[PDB]
Design an enzyme around this catalytic site. Sequence first.
Site, PDB file in Angstrom:
ATOM      1  N   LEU A   1     -32.488  -2.547 123.238  1.00 54.45           N
ATOM      2  CA  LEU A   1     -31.968  -3.712 123.944  1.00 54.45           C
ATOM      3  C   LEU A   1     -31.242  -3.310 125.217  1.00 54.45           C
ATOM      4  O   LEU A   1     -31.064  -4.123 126.129  1.00 54.45           O
ATOM      5  CB  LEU A   1     -31.003  -4.492 123.052  1.00 54.45           C
ATOM      6  CG  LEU A   1     -31.532  -5.103 121.757  1.00 54.45           C
ATOM      7  CD1 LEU A   1     -30.364  -5.517 120.876  1.00 54.45           C
ATOM      8  CD2 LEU A   1     -32.438  -6.290 122.040  1.00 54.45           C
ATOM      9  N   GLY A   2     -30.806  -2.056 125.274  1.00 49.59           N
ATOM     10  CA  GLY A   2     -30.074  -1.577 126.428  1.00 49.59           C
ATOM     11  C   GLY A   2     -29.758  -0.099 126.379  1.00 49.59           C
ATOM     12  O   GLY A   2     -29.864   0.545 125.333  1.00 49.59           O
TER      13      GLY A   2
ATOM     14  N   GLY B   1     -27.007   2.937 128.459  1.00 49.68           N
ATOM     15  CA  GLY B   1     -25.934   3.232 129.391  1.00 49.68           C
ATOM     16  C   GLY B   1     -25.647   4.720 129.422  1.00 49.68           C
ATOM     17  O   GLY B   1     -26.352   5.512 128.796  1.00 49.68           O
ATOM     18  N   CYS B   2     -24.607   5.106 130.149  1.00 49.90           N
ATOM     19  CA  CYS B   2     -24.260   6.513 130.281  1.00 49.90           C
ATOM     20  C   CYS B   2     -23.771   7.125 128.963  1.00 49.90           C
ATOM     21  O   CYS B   2     -23.799   8.343 128.795  1.00 49.90           O
ATOM     22  CB  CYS B   2     -23.206   6.703 131.374  1.00 49.90           C
ATOM     23  SG  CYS B   2     -21.629   5.904 131.024  1.00 49.90           S
ATOM     24  N   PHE B   3     -23.332   6.289 128.027  1.00 52.09           N
ATOM     25  CA  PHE B   3     -22.748   6.805 126.786  1.00 52.09           C
ATOM     26  C   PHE B   3     -23.638   6.654 125.552  1.00 52.09           C
ATOM     27  O   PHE B   3     -23.302   7.158 124.478  1.00 52.09           O
ATOM     28  CB  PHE B   3     -21.381   6.169 126.526  1.00 52.09           C
ATOM     29  CG  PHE B   3     -20.316   6.595 127.498  1.00 52.09           C
ATOM     30  CD1 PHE B   3     -20.039   7.938 127.698  1.00 52.09           C
ATOM     31  CD2 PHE B   3     -19.579   5.651 128.196  1.00 52.09           C
ATOM     32  CE1 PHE B   3     -19.056   8.331 128.585  1.00 52.09           C
ATOM     33  CE2 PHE B   3     -18.594   6.035 129.081  1.00 52.09           C
ATOM     34  CZ  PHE B   3     -18.332   7.380 129.278  1.00 52.09           C
TER      35      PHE B   3
ATOM     36  N   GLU C   1     -27.061   4.025 123.627  1.00 57.70           N
ATOM     37  CA  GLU C   1     -28.005   2.915 123.638  1.00 57.70           C
ATOM     38  C   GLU C   1     -27.572   1.793 122.699  1.00 57.70           C
ATOM     39  O   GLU C   1     -26.683   1.974 121.862  1.00 57.70           O
ATOM     40  CB  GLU C   1     -29.398   3.403 123.241  1.00 57.70           C
ATOM     41  CG  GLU C   1     -29.988   4.463 124.161  1.00 57.70           C
ATOM     42  CD  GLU C   1     -31.265   5.059 123.604  1.00 57.70           C
ATOM     43  OE1 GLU C   1     -31.326   5.299 122.378  1.00 57.70           O
ATOM     44  OE2 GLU C   1     -32.210   5.287 124.387  1.00 57.70           O
ATOM     45  N   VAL C   2     -28.195   0.631 122.863  1.00 60.97           N
ATOM     46  CA  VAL C   2     -28.035  -0.477 121.932  1.00 60.97           C
ATOM     47  C   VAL C   2     -29.416  -0.887 121.457  1.00 60.97           C
ATOM     48  O   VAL C   2     -30.312  -1.147 122.267  1.00 60.97           O
ATOM     49  CB  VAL C   2     -27.342  -1.694 122.565  1.00 60.97           C
ATOM     50  CG1 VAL C   2     -27.160  -2.804 121.528  1.00 60.97           C
ATOM     51  CG2 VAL C   2     -26.002  -1.297 123.167  1.00 60.97           C
TER      52      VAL C   2
ATOM     53  N   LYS D   1     -25.171   0.171 118.194  1.00 62.55           N
ATOM     54  CA  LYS D   1     -24.771   0.974 119.346  1.00 62.55           C
ATOM     55  C   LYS D   1     -24.777   2.445 118.969  1.00 62.55           C
ATOM     56  O   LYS D   1     -24.156   2.843 117.978  1.00 62.55           O
ATOM     57  CB  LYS D   1     -23.374   0.588 119.838  1.00 62.55           C
ATOM     58  CG  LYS D   1     -23.215  -0.880 120.167  1.00 62.55           C
ATOM     59  CD  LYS D   1     -21.850  -1.179 120.769  1.00 62.55           C
ATOM     60  CE  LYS D   1     -21.772  -0.747 122.224  1.00 62.55           C
ATOM     61  NZ  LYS D   1     -20.521  -1.224 122.886  1.00 62.55           N
TER      62      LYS D   1
ATOM     63  N   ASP E   1     -11.295  -5.670 129.385  1.00 59.95           N
ATOM     64  CA  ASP E   1     -12.651  -5.632 129.946  1.00 59.95           C
ATOM     65  C   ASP E   1     -13.296  -7.011 129.813  1.00 59.95           C
ATOM     66  O   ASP E   1     -14.498  -7.138 129.574  1.00 59.95           O
ATOM     67  CB  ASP E   1     -13.491  -4.575 129.214  1.00 59.95           C
ATOM     68  CG  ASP E   1     -14.605  -3.982 130.084  1.00 59.95           C
ATOM     69  OD1 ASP E   1     -14.764  -4.393 131.254  1.00 59.95           O
ATOM     70  OD2 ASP E   1     -15.337  -3.097 129.587  1.00 59.95           O
TER      71      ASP E   1
HETATM   72  N1  LIG Z   1     -24.394  -7.305 119.515  1.00 60.67           N
HETATM   73  C1  LIG Z   1     -25.371  -7.369 120.451  1.00 60.67           C
HETATM   74  N2  LIG Z   1     -26.376  -8.290 120.256  1.00 60.67           N
HETATM   75  C2  LIG Z   1     -27.342  -8.344 121.217  1.00 60.67           C
HETATM   76  N3  LIG Z   1     -27.492  -7.631 122.359  1.00 60.67           N
HETATM   77  C3  LIG Z   1     -26.483  -6.722 122.523  1.00 60.67           C
HETATM   78  C4  LIG Z   1     -25.398  -6.550 121.605  1.00 60.67           C
HETATM   79  N4  LIG Z   1     -24.532  -5.544 122.062  1.00 60.67           N
HETATM   80  C5  LIG Z   1     -25.074  -5.126 123.211  1.00 60.67           C
HETATM   81  N5  LIG Z   1     -26.280  -5.809 123.559  1.00 60.67           N
HETATM   82  C6  LIG Z   1     -27.128  -5.591 124.763  1.00 60.67           C
HETATM   83  O1  LIG Z   1     -26.736  -4.389 125.414  1.00 60.67           O
HETATM   84  C7  LIG Z   1     -25.900  -4.653 126.555  1.00 60.67           C
HETATM   85  C8  LIG Z   1     -24.656  -3.685 126.603  1.00 60.67           C
HETATM   86  O2  LIG Z   1     -23.564  -4.185 125.828  1.00 60.67           O
HETATM   87  P1  LIG Z   1     -22.128  -3.438 125.774  1.00 60.67           P
HETATM   88  O3  LIG Z   1     -21.442  -3.354 124.473  1.00 60.67           O
HETATM   89  O4  LIG Z   1     -21.270  -4.093 126.920  1.00 60.67           O
HETATM   90  O5  LIG Z   1     -22.081  -1.861 126.165  1.00 60.67           O
HETATM   91  P2  LIG Z   1     -21.219  -0.858 127.000  1.00 60.67           P
HETATM   92  O6  LIG Z   1     -21.077  -1.567 128.381  1.00 60.67           O
HETATM   93  O7  LIG Z   1     -21.538   0.581 127.012  1.00 60.67           O
HETATM   94  O8  LIG Z   1     -19.618  -0.710 126.706  1.00 60.67           O
HETATM   95  P3  LIG Z   1     -18.430   0.101 127.331  1.00 60.67           P
HETATM   96  O9  LIG Z   1     -17.517   0.706 126.172  1.00 60.67           O
HETATM   97  O10 LIG Z   1     -17.551  -0.697 128.202  1.00 60.67           O
HETATM   98  S1  LIG Z   1     -19.095   1.855 128.089  1.00 60.67           S
HETATM   99  C9  LIG Z   1     -25.456  -6.124 126.270  1.00 60.67           C
HETATM  100  O11 LIG Z   1     -24.932  -6.653 127.431  1.00 60.67           O
HETATM  101  C10 LIG Z   1     -26.789  -6.754 125.762  1.00 60.67           C
HETATM  102  O12 LIG Z   1     -27.735  -6.749 126.766  1.00 60.67           O
HETATM  103 MG   LIG Z   2     -19.882  -3.626 129.122  1.00 55.36          MG
END
Ligand SMILES: Nc1ncnc2c1ncn2[C@@H]1O[C@H](COP(=O)(O)OP(=O)(O)OP(O)(O)=S)[C@@H](O)[C@H]1O
Ligand SMILES: [Mg+2]
Length: 279
Positions: A19-20, A22-24, A26-27, A41, A132
């Site tokens: 679904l996504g 990032g630098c740290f 995946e989701v 996550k 945040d």
């Molecule tokens: N519970 C979820 N259900 C559905 N899609 C999700 C869910 N969590 C994340 N996603 C997808 O993945 C994207 C990233 O979500 P985040 O949790 O904001 O990750 P993140 O930005 O690394 O957090 P940080 O700690 O600030 S580095 C979301 O905006 C959606 O596109």
């Molecule tokens: Mg975020």
Amino acid sequence: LAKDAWEIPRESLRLEVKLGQGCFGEVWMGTWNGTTRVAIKTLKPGTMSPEAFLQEAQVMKKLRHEKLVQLYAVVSEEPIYIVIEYMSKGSLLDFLKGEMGKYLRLPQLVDMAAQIASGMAYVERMNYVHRDLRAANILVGENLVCKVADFGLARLIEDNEYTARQGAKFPIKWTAPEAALYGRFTIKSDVWSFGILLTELTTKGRVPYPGMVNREVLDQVERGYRMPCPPECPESLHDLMCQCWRKDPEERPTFEYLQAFLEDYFTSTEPQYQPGENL
Ligand SMILES: Nc1ncnc2c1ncn2[C@@H]1O[C@H](COP(=O)(O)OP(=O)(O)OP(O)(O)=S)[C@@H](O)[C@H]1O
Ligand SMILES: [Mg+2]
């Protein structure tokens, strides 16, 4: 290092769709216990400390509410997994800017704001600060259900303030001045962020302080500049944003008040409102 009853066997999860990223990490969307749909996550090896990554799970263990994304379980062994409630419509920010956003009008956007305010009023009652809060960190489910997400930065407040560590950097346009500049994080700096979020809702995903650069925002805001009323947005709602943006944090409203104000908006504040082309 220490494990508790949130731990589950990795074998009980199946990661199905990405679904996504990032630098740290995946989701992923997946299935838990072969029956439950979940989001998962992951922690990318050697990018963040396992203990740092899991702080986010720790916070969620404590904050439980219908309008916060719910924690389900943790896998505390590498690779680290945080298993959470699946939000089918993804990020509020993307939702707002996509086709669906076009069809939304004020009553719906205000209800979404009210739900977010409800979640945040809970955060407020629990003595936490999120740090945040913004449309990119709100998740959307079925039937316009909105929940606050991403608790990585959230902290329990001791001594009325969470003072940020040296080196910490925060996004100026979405963060209260006293928090960005001096590191003073309180529920009131979240209230400032909520005000920014209201502009994201009413512009359906536009960037705050459009055209302005970070130093200019910092400079003009200190001088008293505030974003003007968005197009088609009633002045009473912008007045609410301006309250969230008071220089003195203690003069900013509580989330308890914000939630009530938005719940009752169309009866108490704008009884004769009618939908325009966009809002
Ligand atoms: N519970 C979820 N259900 C559905 N899609 C999700 C869910 N969590 C994340 N996603 C997808 O993945 C994207 C990233 O979500 P985040 O949790 O904001 O990750 P993140 O930005 O690394 O957090 P940080 O700690 O600030 S580095 C979301 O905006 C959606 O596109
Ligand atoms: Mg975020």
